[PDB]
Structures are given as C-alpha cells and as structure tokens.
C-alpha cells in the first residue's frame, strides 16, 4: 500500500513488472482490496456508477455535436435516400492527396460515413436542424457535469448512503419500475405526441411554441371524458408523404400494425400508443412492494412461501432472499443475463420490425446494427455466467441455502452437465454430418442426393402469424379462424400487408439452409452454455480438485500432479467459453449477413441453394464478397474503403498475434527474458540505465487473458471491416 | 480565429501531447515508492 497499487500490499511488494500488470487488472475488484468494508464497497460502487453514466452522456453529447458541427444532417433530412450521412470530419496529417480526395467524395472535405443509424433515429424522433442537435449536445454535456458532481458529493462523509439504504430492495424496485421505466415511458409518449408526430406531419413544435400548439385539435377533453377513441380517428393515409402535410392525419394513438407505406417503418402513432400502454403497465408494476405506507408485498415472504408441497424442489426458495441481497455477484449475473436477452431481442426485432424511417434502405447500417448488438449480447451472456461462477466461489453459503433450488442444482450438477454434453454431441455430430454429406454429394456433381430438411415447424409458426407462402391454413393464415376474426378488428390488416410483403424483413422466407444453420446456432448455444455451466457448477470443486473454492475464482492451475491440472479454474471456463461465444455469434451474424446480401442483391436463390454445404459459404459468401474490401487499395490506387482494407488486415494480424500468447506458454519466455537481462547488465553505455521493476514473463493467467483479448479484438475488427466494406462497396 | 482551425490545433494535442504527458505521469506514479 506504499507503492502502486495501494489497494494490495501483496502486489505492491512484488519486485517484478508483474506488480504493474496485476495492479491494473485488479483495480475494479473492490471486494478483494485491502481493508475494504461492505459499506465502503457499496459507496465506491455508487460513485463509480455516477462516473460511468457521465461517460455515457459525454459520448452521446459528442455524437450530437460532431453531427451538428461536421455532418450533413440537414441535407440528409431534405433527401434521405440519396445522401450518405456523415459521422465526423477527418484530419490526418499522414494522408496523401489521393486519400484526401478519396475520402471527400460527395463532399468538400474528408469524412467518415456513419453506420450507427443515428440520422434515421434522430429524424424519426423529430430532429430537423443542426441547431436542435447542438442544443441536445449542450444539454447532455451539462448533465454529464451534474452526474460527476453527484458522484463526488455522494462520497462526502455527510452524503455517503448507509448499507441499509443500498439493501432496501422494495423501495429501489418500486422506483425503478414505476419511475425509471413507467414514468420515463410516459414522458417518451409525451415527446412523441407533442414533437415527433407533428414533425412527421410537416409541423414544427419546439421549445419556442410547444405550450401553445396542442398535439391534437380536440385537446385533452377526450382524455378526461373517457371518450378516448377520438385520439385514434383519422390516421395518416396510405399516401402520406413523411415530413410533409400531404396525406397526413391527426390520430396520435393508433393500433394500425405493419409499416408506414413510404418509410417502411413503424407508425409513430403506433409507437406512441405502445409507450403509453407500457407506461401504464410499469407504473402499475411499481406499486407491488411495501416501502413506507403499510401496503404492498415483502419479497422475502414471497420467496419463502413458494415451496411445492410435494417436495420435488426440496426447501423451495427459502434462503434465496438473503443470498441475492448479500451477493453483488449474483445480482450482477442476473442483470447481465437479462441484458443479454434484451440485447439479442433488440437485434432480432430491429431488423424485422423497422422502427426508424428509411432505416431498411441503409443496408450497411442494418448489417452493422445487427452485428453490433448480437456481439454485445454474447459478451453480456458470457459475463452473466462468469459472475454466476464468481458468486459460487465467493458468495454462496451452503448452510444458508440448505436444500433449496440453488443447492439442488449443485446436487445434480453431474446429470445437468452430462445431458448438456449429450445434446451438444448430438447436435455437432448430426449438423456437421449433414453439411459434410451435402458437400460431398455436390462435389461429385450430384446435388439431388443432398439431405435438405424443410424447416417445417418454423414455417408453421410464420403461417400462424399470417404468412401465406407455405400453404398452411392455420390461425392468422386462415380466413375462418377465430384468431383472424378477432385480429381483423385492430391490427391484422396492416400486419397482414407487411408479413405477406416480400420487400420487408417481417418473417423472411426460409428453407433447408435456414434449418441447417439454425441447428448450427443451437450447437453453438449449447456448447457455450455447457462450458459456462460446468465452470459455474464446478467452481467450488471437483473430483480432480475437491478444495477448489480455497484457491479462488481465478488461479493458473494446481500443478502437474494428479495427471496435470492446466485450465482447472472457473475463470478458465470463462476463457474457453469466450472462444465458443465468438464462434457462435460469428455463425449467427454470417447467417444474417449472407441471407440479407442475397436478398439485397436480388437473388435469394443463391443463398437458398448454396447455404446447404460449407463450400457454398466459403465461396459464395466470404470469397465472393471479399472483393471490394480487398481492392480498397491496390497497385492502381485507393478509394474510401481503403481504411476498411487496412482494418481487415489489422484484425487478421491481431488475431494471429493472440495465437502466440494462447499456444506458447510461460517457461519458454521466462528463460528468454533471463538472457535479455544478462545482455542488458553486460552491455556498456546501456548498463548506465537500469530497470526498477525486474523484467519477468507474463503470468499464466495473464497470458491467457492477453491471448484472449488479442483474439477477440482481431475477430471483431476483421468482421466489422468485412461487413461494412462488403455491404457498402456492393450497394 | 475560427472553429474550422480546431482540428489542426486540437488533434496534435489529443493524440501526441496528452498521451505523452499521461504516460509520463503514470510512469512517475508507478515508480513512486511512497504514494500514501
């Protein structure tokens, strides 16, 4: 605690370069720091959370500022389909004259084109001018200052909350449900009705005039008289030109369903009504728990009451309240799991149910958004399981959870792991076998011998939602069904128009290639889960290392004895599962991208036929679409895709460099560094200078982490360059 | 003075001066024998 890191005496006394590395890697593990108390832990976390929120708001304010200052948002608004939205200007002294010209196409100065979808979103929510964006940027900058002030203040002695405040479950949940979610949703509905909908109807409503410009000619009289249908009368017509008054209606709340005919995105009235109903649901939900007013539930009583009388769950949920409350790692695991599900749902629903005007026409932005959110979802899921394993090592008390569901998971971990292994092996064997059989028969020029299972169950689901192509007369595809007669009253016409429209992504047409790729995706999910679940469930111990909990979540190994124990810790399960998460998300995004590239290229049949064997993927997806990317620069010149070509090679290099850390291990490097130390000590004029931290090879765990980071960064950068360059250089 | 000059002014400050001083400060902090 006298040297860096001051939070660890053990590290501060290490005389090697290790002291530095580990300090950096342990700075945010506040529970392990010397002299930490629980109360101080919660307070420091609270302040760090304020800092993180400040960072987020600074990032958003910066996006707004750079678009306002250097973007073409007004030109894009005037002409969405023929403008490429600008992210920010380039100033790079290393550029040549050719590079400046190449990056200034369609403009007077070099720019990067944004693929984040910010222009479409800001356009949809009512932004029209650079001044409005600049005002948003200023507001967020000031809000970031306010958050920094709050973080500083809640660390002052008179303003540090107590542990009881941090452990008040019912009140925090009530406020986050009713206020953070329900009232925020209500306020967003208010924005949509006052600002965004009028903007879509060619009417300016801003801070200058919103108090005297009612969002509906009938005012609030219908709301207070219960005659609410007035707010649904007269929606925008099918000929409504977005951003203009031609064809516009006056409905502010609707349940039209489907898409606006010109933007091919959700109706703004539909989204406003969605957020209003959401606001009601969440405000109601936020009144469930008892805070200060006698009424409401106590969570502990709820948990303790749910034990099946038969006993097949043992003690039931008794003990879980204290376990969750006292374990930040279990809380974080639950948060990361739900966030991962929500991020995947974001990716899946944004591409199909386009929420922002003209977004479905910005192909590169669509691909970038889907890939971005799916990779983030993968990271969040891996994190959820890592923190579950950490909870098992550090926070789980067997006596507090005696015979409850959490303990019974540990009691049948062998059955769980063995069955997950069987499922993984079955999926791998048969999916790889079918792909290989198809590859072989196609190689021998006999494609009619392929095994091509029709995804009948999914096609039936599509039909049930109204898709007519598959000839299933079930539910919403059936004229006489009760579901159809009921749904035709509200949303079914617009939904049926969208779903049976092949120009939309609403339930894309599927076939055997979709079947095989989906089983591959299931393989990835099951194997990633198997690694993570086995790591969590064996985190406390196994036959090979029965006392593993005494050694912590992360430790190199237990030595070469007992047959060898490399990669035995739960951290090592996280490390192994990162590879499988990356591979799985890669399969997912490859599938999404190839199907969309063939759709956008006007030839879905190419995917439909070539996706049934691996060579089709290698040749018709990767090889064929590499072309504009690899020609971003060449012996004849360069274009604006040269940055993506360079990033593509950069990613390949980083990935391969990660291989070095992953394959070669510590002893070799330590022996080499010994000769390096000898050389420096014996070299005149250089031995005038000496290190103050003894050079050592990176540690076993550190090398695993460094290899994993290099692998992951290379993977991400390579694929991002490919997806952006291929989509943007083709279309 | 104009805002259009800011990149050529600010970029060398952000990408050269700031990392150098930050790295020097962190080096000095990690080499300090008594920090508290």
């Amino acid at each position: 605690a006298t040297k860096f890191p001051k939070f660890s005496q053990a590290l501060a006394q290490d005389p090697a370069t290790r002291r530095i590395w580990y300090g950096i890697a342990t700075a945010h593990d506040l529970e392990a720091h010397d002299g930490m108390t629980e109360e101080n832990l919660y307070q420091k976390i609270f302040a760090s959370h304020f800092g993180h929120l400040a960072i987020i708001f600074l990032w958003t304010s910066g996006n707004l500022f750079h678009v306002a200052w250097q973007g073409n948002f007004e030109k894009w608004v005037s002409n969405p389909l023929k403008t490429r939205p600008i992210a920010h200007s380039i100033w790079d002294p290393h550029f040549g004259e050719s590079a400046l010209k190449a990056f200034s196409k369609g403009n007077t100065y070099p720019v990067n084109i944004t693929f984040s979808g910010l222009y479409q979103w800001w356009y949809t929510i009512g932004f029209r001018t650079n001044q409005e964006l600049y005002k948003g940027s200023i507001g967020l900058l000031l809000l970031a200052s306010v958050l920094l002030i709050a973080g500083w203040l809640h660390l002052q002695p008179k303003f540090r909350p107590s542990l009881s405040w941090f452990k008040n479950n019912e009140s925090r949940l009530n406020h986050h449900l009713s206020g953070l979610l329900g009232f925020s949703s209500l306020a967003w509905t208010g924005h949509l009705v006052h600002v965004a909908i009028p903007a879509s109807r060619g009417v300016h409503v801003g801070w200058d005039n919103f108090l005297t410009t009612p969002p509906h000619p009938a005012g609030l009289t219908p709301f207070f008289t219960g005659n609410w249908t007035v707010y649904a009368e007269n929606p925008d017509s099918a000929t409504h030109v977005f951003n203009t008054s031609e064809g516009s209606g006056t409905a502010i709340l609707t349940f039209l369903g489907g898409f606006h005919p010109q933007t091919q995105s959700l109706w703004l009235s539909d989204m406003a009504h969605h957020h209003l109903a959401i606001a009601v649901v969440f405000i109601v939900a936020g009144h469930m728990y008892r805070t200060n007013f006698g009424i409401g539930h106590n969570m502990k009583e709820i948990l303790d009451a749910h034990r099946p009388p038969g006993g097949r769950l043992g003690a039931g949920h008794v003990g879980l309240f204290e376990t969750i409350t006292n374990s930040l790692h279990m809380q974080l695991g639950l948060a990361l799991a739900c966030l991962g599900v929500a991020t995947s749902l974001t990716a899946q629903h944004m591409y199909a149910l386009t929420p922002y005007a003209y977004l479905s026409k910005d192909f590169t932005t669509e691909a970038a958004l889907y890939t971005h959110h799916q990779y983030i979802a993968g990271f969040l899921m891996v994190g959820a399981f890592a923190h579950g394993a950490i909870f098992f090592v550090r926070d789980y008390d067997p006596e507090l959870n005696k015979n409850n569901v959490l303990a019974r998971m540990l009691e049948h971990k062998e059955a769980i792991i063995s069955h997950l292994s069987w499922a993984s092996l079955f999926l791998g064997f048969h999916t790889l076998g079918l792909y290989i059989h198809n590859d072989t028969v196609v190689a021998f020029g006999q494609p009619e011998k392929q095994i091509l299972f029709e995804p009948l169950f999914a096609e039936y689901i599509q039909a049930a939602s109204g898709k007519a192509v598959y000839q299933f007369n079930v539910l919403l595809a059936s004229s006489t069904s009760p579901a159809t007669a009921a749904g035709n009253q509200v949303w079914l016409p617009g939904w049926l128009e969208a779903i049976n429209n092949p120009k939309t992504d609403l339930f894309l047409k599927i076939g055997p290639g979709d079947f095989l790729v989906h089983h591959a995706i299931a393989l990835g999910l099951h194997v990633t889960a198997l690694i993570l679940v086995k790591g969590a469930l064996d985190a406390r111990g196994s036959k090979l290392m029965p006392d593993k909990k005494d050694f912590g979540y992360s430790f190199p190994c237990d030595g070469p004895g007992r047959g060898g124990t490399c990669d035995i810790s739960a951290w090592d399960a996280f490390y192994l599962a990162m590879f499988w998460m990356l591979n799985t998300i890669g399969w997912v995004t490859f599938y999404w991208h190839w199907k969309h590239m063939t759709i956008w290229g006007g030839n879905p049949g190419q995917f439909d036929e070539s996706s049934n064997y691996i060579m089709g993927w290698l040749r018709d997806y990767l090889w064929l679409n590499s072309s504009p990317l690899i020609n971003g620069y060449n012996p004849f010149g360069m274009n604006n895709l040269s940055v993506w070509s360079w990033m593509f090679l950069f990613g390949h290099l980083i990935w391969a460099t990660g291989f070095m850390f992953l394959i070669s291990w510590r002893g070799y490097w330590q022996e080499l560094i010994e000769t390096l130390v000898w050389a420096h000590e014996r070299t005149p004029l250089a031995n005038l200078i000496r290190w103050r931290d003894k050079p050592v090879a990176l540690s076993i765990v550190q090398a695993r982490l460094v290899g994993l980071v290099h692998f992951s960064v290379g993977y991400i950068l390579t694929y991002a360059a490919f997806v952006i360059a291929s989509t943007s250089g083709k279309f | 003075m104009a805002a259009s000059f800011l990149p050529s002014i600010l970029v060398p400050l952000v990408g050269l001066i700031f990392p150098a001083f930050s790295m020097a400060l962190f080096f000095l902090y990690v080499q300090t024998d008594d920090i508290a």
């Binding site: 420091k44 302040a47 760090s48 304020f50 800092g51 400040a54 600074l58 500022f65 306002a68 200052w69 650079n130 001044q131 600049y134 940027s137 200023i138 900058l141 000031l142 970031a144 200052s145 920094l148 002030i149 973080g151 500083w152 660390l155 | 003075m1 104009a2 805002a3 800011l6």
Partner: peptide, 30 residues
Amino acid sequence: MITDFQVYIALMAALLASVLAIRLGATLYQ
C-alpha cells in the same frame, strides 16, 4: 450552421466537465 461562438461554448462546458471528472476521480481514489 454551428457558429464559432457555439463551438467555444461547448468547449467551455467540456472544460467544466473535465475538472469535475478529475475531482471525482481523485475522490474515488481516496
């Protein structure tokens, strides 16, 4: 377009945010 004055205003606000960030960082350090 964004004026020079508006850019300078944004930069002043950024400077404020930066000094508050340094303050919070040093406080969390303790």
